[PDB]
């Protein structure tokens, strides 16, 4: 770990050269020393509050919502220092963590980030007040290149189907949980009573993890089958039968 | 049709008032669907038990034809001797999706006013005519339990399908074009601030061209 | 309500009075009316108002042959109680009820 | 009064401070004092306090974990009653709506111009919360185990039964600690937990 | 610009002027001229004019006060009609929704190019207003006095009985005062006051 702090009582010009220092060394470790580098740029909403501060020191007129006009170029000069190259074994991937104000996606900080980055992960207040750690809801979250990342030679060949089936059973189990309050616990069928028992086990065994439990990618999928085994098959319609026969019976 | 003043906190108030009415349809679409699901299977239980009483009332009217063959004509003794009823009904309540339905359940406070009817001629064709029509009353009260819940269900569907269409067509198209007015009016407060700041940076440059 | 009323016929009501549905409180009314061939339509309309506006009448049985005479009268009744049921008779089984029109 | 998270003094403060006690206007107009709402407020000092809470009041961390779910499952069901009403609510859903009603009325509400609630010491805070979650734990157990057992308690059995206990839970905020000893208050709250286990 | 009354020329004018005749665009999408919106418009020359009104037209001050309550309570109930429906209205409210339709079509509407409505003198303004308010007062007397006891007047027979009186009230805008004498026209009204007293 190469750790770069920058406190709030530090100079606000040093917040600008902090992701430029961290990505210069991450371009020395990756594709100059050939090691796979993860760059975690936390509080990317406090970077662009320092970019707005020095933009008023150079006597510029503030653009949209106070932020400068060149913020799409300035954010993309520290995001696009990523990816793999052709002749070297190194790679560099970024997780730029930002706090959108007032849970707004139309703010210029998460809107000019969603234009250049490749899928988002939502930490939401709904699951956080419910005391679920980590409070990551997977219904609006998306990884645009997860169809490339998983596979047979990469993790194992059932990752594409157990991710689609856990996501489809989560949308139904959240939909029928709105039926439990206006219809009743009795009048719903035997199918919708199985999605409600999936919901209380998905958000407590799969998502709810604890801050010191290091689950591998294989221990994640094995929990992903213990929640799909409480359904009978032919409800698991997103999983093909070529992969349903090997991993279901246990 | 707009409501209030654009102030950048009215944009997040109205986005929550839009959030209340966006989930006000999807909470009331399924309530109007749970009422429609029971409405479409009660109607199957109605028509199936209009063809079931078509053969029960055929057997019961033929059992009266067997009883007049044996014991004369008792159509003036039976009609005259009514004093108190034996089979009554009590109104029960049952509900689907929070809307109560009046249903009927029959009970017998049994003292027979026709215990002696015939008794020297007949009496065996009677008390099997009484069984073939008490069985028809036990059926026709279960049909009347499905008639009073049928006509009170589509009374509570029209008050729900109107309240769903009052949100999708009057309340939400008034909010989503109120929110369209906040954004176009908050863009004009930014250009007026843009024109006032560029006016000053043109004036500060001229004063810095004199002091050279 | 708590009673079952029948308009019926001459042979229909004497089968249902043997079922045990008829009650006689002469202060108000009897809870049935035997319709012969020589009763006008004006007499059927008057007792039909009596069974709708009574408190304890919960179920109303009537033959469909009789119900077509007062077909304009029971379509005006659009309440939940009392249930107006249409039953078959001699050589007049069933064509179409007012309740299945409401669809 | 306005500019909740879109205000350049508040949007700059919340990137610096650890604890934010958000005063709500809907609680202040209905005279709920103090007017701190429990959904947009936060505190990032809970991981640093868990070593303190595991030495002095070791029962507290499972209580305020559960006490925030009850205050949050109520607001999930609050928008259901405002649309369709309390008609077809389940027995597990109606059993929070009195405990969450009891928390906002007796635990959270506090009058500082009153000689007993001008300061609530932390044994009185743990003491009345360790009974109002235990009553939630017993009654939730008293519903789901008698479910499918032909005498399922519909919770209106509980409400008329525990009328003295619901008066004992509502009267927990009155146990004056200025003129009432600490050890008496610890004895009074301990008797409610035995009275609850007796009557359940 | 754009029909927006939150305009720095309009908002600077309304802080100076005493009268405000706010025209409306939706009252021109149907040919309702003059298109003065009666809900937002006002006039602050009321305390100055009641001494003139209590000297010349003494009945007029409660006439416009009652006509301003009919026109406002129609807007409170037309919001219910477009959401809930006309079937859930009381009999004191269905009479209001149709005397207001008589006000907006006979009294308020005025076609300036017709010779009978190019100029309406003030005896004709109070003359056709004292008829349509008293008809609302008389049709209120056929509801509250016959409240529940007898077979009462449910407003459906007032339409049928007074089918020519509702034509006598909606055609008073035709009583040309250029070529029709004042005394003539005034007499024509008090006669229509006599016909409603005989018909009610």
Beta carbons of A14 and A69 less than 8 angstroms apart: no
Q: ∠A85-A87-A88 over CA atoms, to 5°?
A: 70
Pick from A83, A42, A46: nearest CA to A67: A46
SS3 at position B104? strand
Under 8 Å CB-to-CB from E120, ≥6 apart: which residues?
E110, E177
The helix or strand, by DSSP H or E, that contains position B96, with its residue range, turns out to be strand B87-96
- Cα C102 to its chain centre, rounded Å, is 19
With a CB cutoff of 8 Å and minimum separation 6, the contacts of C22 are B82, B85, C6, C13, C16, C30, C31, C32
Enclosing domain of residue E85:
44-200
Output the six-digit token pair for A63.
Answer: 């653009």
Per DSSP, the three-state class of D112 is: coil
List, in sequence order, every residue forming a beta bridge with B90; answer none if it has no partner. Answer: B105
| Structure tokens that stand for B186 in this block | 């908050």
**Contact C61/C4 with Cβ under 8 angstroms?**
yes
DSSP A39: E
Eight-state DSSP code of residue D14? T
Copy the structure tokens of residue B73: 């004509």
Taking the CA atoms of residue E60, residue E64, residue E70 and residue E75 in that order, the dihedral angle to the nearest 10 degrees is: 170
CA distances from C69 to C16, C35, C42, C48, C94 (A): 22, 12, 10, 12, 15
The total of other beta-carbon atoms located within 10 Å of residue B97's CB is 22
- With CB atoms and an 8 Å threshold, state whether B190 touches A64: yes
Q: Which residue of E has its CA nearest to B165?
A: E83
Structural domains counted in chain B: 1
* A144 annotated binding-site participant: yes
Pairwise CB contact (< 8 Å): B12 & A102: yes
Q: Measured between alpha carbons, how far is C56 from A58 in angstroms, rounded to an integer?
A: 89
**Measured between alpha carbons, how far is A103 from A123 in angstroms, rounded to an integer?**
10
In whole angstroms, what is the distance from residue B43 CA to residue B36 CA? 11
* Domain-embedded: residue B87: yes
Nearest CA to A107 out of A184, A35, A48 is that of: A48
Please indicate whether, in this complex, the C-beta atoms of B104 and C83 are within 8 angstroms of each other: yes
In a domain, B150, yes or no: yes
Place of tokens 């029928």: A176
Spacing of C-alpha D35 from chain mean position: 15
Token pair for A136: 């990551």
Are residues B130 and C17, on separate chains, in Cβ contact within 8 Å? no
Which residue, among B19, B22, B24, B98, would best test binding to D if mutated, counting the most D CBs under 10 Å from its CB?
B98
Rounded Cα–Cα distance for residues D30 and D27 (Å): 5
Scored b (16 or more CB within 10 A) or e, E14-48 reads eeeeeeeeeebeebeeeebbebbebeeeeeeeeee
- Asked whether the beta carbons of A60 and A97 are under 8 A apart, the reply is no
Question: What span, in angstroms and rounded, lies between the C-alpha atoms of E50 and A105?
Answer: 58
**Peptide bond preceding C82 in cis form (omega within 30 of 0):** yes
Choose the mutation target among E6, E39, E83 for the interface with B, i.e. most B CBs under 10 Å: E83
Helix (H) or strand (E) holding B183, with range, is helix B179-210
Q: What is the DSSP letter of A232?
A: P
Pick from C23, C84, C88: CB nearest B85: C23
Measure B52 CA to nearest chain A CA, in Å. Answer: 27
Would you say the C-alpha torsion C75, C81, C82, C87 has a positive or negative sign?
A: positive
What is the 3 state secondary structure string of D30-93?
CCCCCCECCCCCEECCHHHHHHHHCCCCCCCHHHHHHHHHHHHHHHHHHHHHCCCCCCCCCHHH
Secondary structure element (H or E) that encloses residue B101, with its range: strand B99-108
Residue A58: how many CB atoms within 10 A of its CB? 7
What range defines the domain where residue B78 resides? Answer: 9-210
For residue D71, give both structure tokens: 């205050």
Gap between the Cα atoms of D59 and D53, Å rounded: 8
Q: Give CA separation, A52 vs A41, A48, B45, D13, in Å.
A: 18, 6, 70, 16
On whether the CB atoms of residues B196 and B202 are closer than 8 A, the answer is no
Q: Beta-carbon neighbour count of residue B92 at 10 Å?
A: 12
Given the DSSP bridges, would you call strands B87-96 and A122-123 parallel, antiparallel or unpaired?
unpaired
In order of B18, B77, C30, C53, the CA distances from C27 in angstroms are 61, 22, 9, 16
Sign of CA dihedral D164, D167, D169, D172: negative
How far C1 CA lies from chain B's nearest CA (Å)?
7
Give the three-state DSSP class for C85: strand
Token pair of A54, please?
Answer: 């020095």
What's the CA gap between B15 and B160, in Å, rounded? 25
Cβ distance of A182 and B96 shorter than 8 Å: no
- Among B31, B98, B201, the residue with its CB nearest the CB of A59 is B201
Neighbours of B144 (CB within 10 A): 25
Q: Torsion-angle region of residue A236: left (phi > 0), alpha (psi -120 to 50) or beta?
A: beta
Query: Mapping DSSP to helix (H, G, I), strand (E, B) and coil, where does residue B57 land?
Result: helix
Experimental technique, in short, is cryo-EM
Residue among A42, A46, A74 at smallest CA distance from A60: A74
Q: How far is B4 from chain E (nearest CA, A)?
A: 11
Shortest Cα–Cα distance, C82 to chain B (Å) = 8
Is residue B97 a contact partner of residue B152, using CB atoms and an 8 Å limit? no
Strands of chain C, DSSP E = 3-6, 24-25, 29-30, 57-63, 83-87
Q: In sequence order, which residues have a C-beta less than 8 Å from that of residue D45 and are 6 or more positions away?
A: D18, D19
**CA B96, chain centre distance (Å):** 8
Q: To which residue do tokens 């499972």 refer?
A: D62
CB distance E75 to E24 below 8 Å: no
- Interface check for E6 against chain B (CB to CB < 8 A): the answer is yes
Alpha helices (H) in B30-100, listed in sequence order: 31-48, 53-70, 77-80
Q: How far apart are the first and last CA of chain C?
A: 26
* Cα E159 to Cα E94: distance, rounded to the nearest angstrom: 12
User: In this structure, what are the phi and psi dihedrals at residue E95, rounded to the nearest 5 degrees?
Assistant: -75, -30
Q: H/E/C letters for each residue in chain E?
A: CCCCCCCCCHHHHCCCCCEECCECCHHHHCCCCCCECCCCCEECCCCCCHHHHHHHCCCHHHHHHHHHHHHHHHHHHHHHHCCCCHHHCCHHHHCHHHHHHHHHHHHCCCCCCCCCCCCCCHHHHHHCHHHHHHHHHHHHHHHHCCCCCCCCCCCHHHHHHCCCHHHHHCCHHHCCCCCCCHHHHHHHHHHHHHHHHHHC
Question: What are the CB-based long-range contacts (under 8 Å, 24+) for E63-70?
Answer: E63/E126, E63/E129, E63/E130, E63/E133, E64/E129, E66/E133, E66/E136, E66/E137, E67/E103, E67/E107, E67/E129, E67/E133, E70/E96, E70/E99, E70/E100, E70/E103, E70/E133, E70/E136
Give the whole-angstrom CA distance, residue E197 versus residue C78.
37
CB–CB of D11 and A185 under 8 A?
A: no
Q: At a CB cut-off of 8 Å and minimum separation 6, what does B62 contact?
A: none
Q: Collapsing DSSP states into helix, strand and coil, what is residue B160?
A: helix
- Residues B156-191 as b or e (16 or more Cβ within 10 Å = b): bbeebbebbeebeeebbeebeebbebbeebeeeeee
- Say if strands A91-94 and C3-6 run parallel, antiparallel, or are unpaired: unpaired
CA gap D105, D100 in Å, rounded: 9
Helix (H/G/I), strand (E/B), else coil: C93: coil
Q: Would B3 be classed as within a structural domain?
A: no
Dist CA A112 CA A75 (whole Å): 8
Q: How far apart are CA D73 and CA E12, in angstroms?
A: 50
- Interface mutation vs chain A, best among B36, B97, B189, most A CBs within 10 Å: B97
- Tell me the nearest-neighbour CA distance from B160 into chain C, angstroms: 17
* Subunit contact A187:B97, Cβ cutoff 8 A: yes
CA dihedral for A134, A139, A140, A144, sign (positive or negative): positive
> At A233, is the secondary structure helix, strand, or coil?
coil
Q: Is the dihedral of CA E17, E18, E23, E24 positive or negative?
A: positive
- Report how far residue D180's alpha carbon sits from residue D167's, in angstroms, rounded to the nearest whole number: 19
Separation between Cα atoms, residue B149 and residue B172, nearest integer Å: 33
| Burial tier of B208 (Cβ tally within 10 Å: 0-12, 13-18, 19+) | exposed
Residue numbers of B between 135 and 174 with CB closer than 8 Å to C? 136-137, 140-141, 143-144, 147-148, 150-152, 154-155
CB contact under 8 A, D80 and A182: yes
In a domain, B4, yes or no: no
- Contact in structure between C64 and C88 (CB atoms under 8 Å): yes
**B27 to A62: CB separation less than 8 angstroms, yes or no:** no
Residues in Cβ contact with B149 at an 8 Å cutoff, skipping those fewer than 6 apart: B42, B94, B101, B102, B103
Burial-class residue E108 by CB neighbours within 10 Å (0-12, 13-18, 19+). middle
Rg (CA), chain A: 22
Of B94, B201, B195, nearest to B148 by C-alpha is B94
Q: How far apart are CA A50 and CA A75, in angstroms?
A: 12
């Amino acid at each position: 770990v190469c750790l770069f702090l920058n406190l709030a009582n530090d100079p606000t010009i040093e917040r600008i050269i902090t992701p430029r220092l961290a990505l210069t060394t991450a371009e020395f470790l990756a594709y100059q020393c050939e090691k796979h580098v993860l760059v975690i740029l936390t509080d990317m909403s406090s970077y662009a509050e320092a970019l707005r501060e020095v933009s008023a020191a150079r006597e510029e007129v503030p653009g949209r919502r106070g932020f400068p006009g060149y913020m799409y170029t300035d954010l993309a000069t520290i995001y696009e220092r990523a990816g793999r190259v052709e002749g070297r074994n190194g790679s560099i991937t970024q997780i730029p963590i930002l706090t959108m104000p007032n849970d707004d996606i139309t703010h210029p900080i998460p809107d000019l980030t969603g234009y250049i980055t490749e899928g988002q992960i939502y930490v939401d207040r709904q699951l956080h007040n419910r005391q679920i750690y980590p409070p990551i809801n997977v219904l609006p979250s998306l990884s645009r290149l997860m169809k490339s990342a998983i596979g047979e030679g990469m993790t194992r060949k059932d990752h594409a189907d157990v991710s689609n089936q856990l996501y489809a059973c989560y949308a139904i189990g959240k939909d029928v949980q709105a039926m439990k309050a206006v219809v009743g616990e009795e009048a719903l069928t035997s199918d919708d009573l199985l999605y409600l028992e999936f919901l209380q086990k998905f958000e407590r065994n799969f998502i709810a993890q604890g801050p010191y439990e290091n689950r591998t990618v294989y221990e994640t999928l094995d929990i992903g089958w213990q929640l799909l085994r409480i359904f009978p098959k032919e409800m698991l319609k997103r999983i093909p039968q070529s992969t349903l026969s090997e991993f279901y019976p246990r | 049709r707009i409501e209030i003043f654009p102030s950048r906190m009215a944009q997040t108030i109205m986005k929550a008032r839009l959030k209340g009415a966006q989930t006000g349809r999807n909470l009331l679409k399924k309530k109007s669907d749970a009422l429609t699901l029971r409405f479409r299977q009660i109607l199957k239980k109605i028509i199936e038990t209009k063809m079931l009483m078509g053969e029960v009332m055929r057997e019961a009217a033929f059992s009266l034809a067997e009883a007049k063959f044996t014991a004369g004509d008792f159509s003036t003794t039976v009609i005259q001797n009514v004093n108190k009823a034996q089979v009554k009904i009590r109104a029960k309540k049952d509900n689907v999706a929070g809307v109560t339905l009046p249903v009927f359940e029959h009970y017998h406070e049994g003292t027979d006013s026709y215990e002696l009817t015939g008794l020297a001629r007949g009496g065996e064709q009677l008390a099997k005519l009484k069984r073939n029509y008490a069985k028809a009353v036990e059926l026709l009260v279960e049909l009347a339990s499905l008639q009073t819940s049928f006509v009170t269900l589509d009374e509570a569907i029209k008050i729900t399908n109107r309240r769903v269409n009052a949100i999708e067509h009057v309340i939400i198209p008034r909010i989503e074009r109120t929110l369209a007015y906040i954004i176009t009016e908050l863009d004009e407060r930014e250009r007026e601030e843009f024109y006032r700041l560029k006016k000053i940076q043109e004036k500060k440059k001229i004063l810095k061209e004199k002091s050279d | 309500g708590k009673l079952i009323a029948v308009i019926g016929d001459e042979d229909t009501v004497t089968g249902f009075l043997l079922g045990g549905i008829g009650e006689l409180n002469k202060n108000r009314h009897p809870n049935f009316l035997v319709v012969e061939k020589d009763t006008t339509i004006n007499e059927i309309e008057d007792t039909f108002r009596q069974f709708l506006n009574r408190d304890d009448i919960g179920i109303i049985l009537i033959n469909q042959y009789i119900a077509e005479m007062v077909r304009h009268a029971l379509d005006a009744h659009q309440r939940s109680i009392p249930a107006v049921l249409e039953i078959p008779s001699k050589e007049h089984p069933y064509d179409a009820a007012k309740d299945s029109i409401l669809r | 009064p306005g500019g909740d998270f879109s205000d350049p003094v508040t949007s700059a403060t919340l990137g610096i401070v650890q604890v934010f006690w958000g005063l709500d206007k809907k609680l202040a107009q209905r005279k709920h004092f103090p007017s701190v709402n429990w959904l947009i407020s936060y505190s990032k000092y809970m991981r640093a306090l868990d070593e303190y809470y595991d030495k002095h009041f070791t029962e507290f961390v499972p209580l305020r974990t559960k006490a925030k779910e009850i205050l949050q499952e109520e607001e999930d069901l609050a928008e259901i009653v405002q649309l369709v009403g309390k008609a077809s609510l389940a027995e597990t859903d109606k059993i929070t709506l009195e405990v969450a009603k009891l928390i906002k009325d007796d635990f959270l509400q506090q009058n500082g111009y009153t000689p007993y609630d001008r300061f609530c010491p932390f044994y009185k805070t743990v003491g009345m919360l360790s009974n109002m979650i235990a009553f939630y734990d017993m009654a939730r157990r008293a519903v789901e185990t008698t479910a499918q057992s032909d005498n399922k308690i519909t919770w209106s059995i509980i409400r008329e039964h525990m009328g003295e206990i619901l008066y004992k839970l509502s009267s927990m905020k009155f146990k004056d600690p200025v003129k009432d000893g600490e050890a008496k208050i610890k004895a009074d709250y301990a008797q409610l937990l035995e009275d609850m286990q007796n009557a359940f």
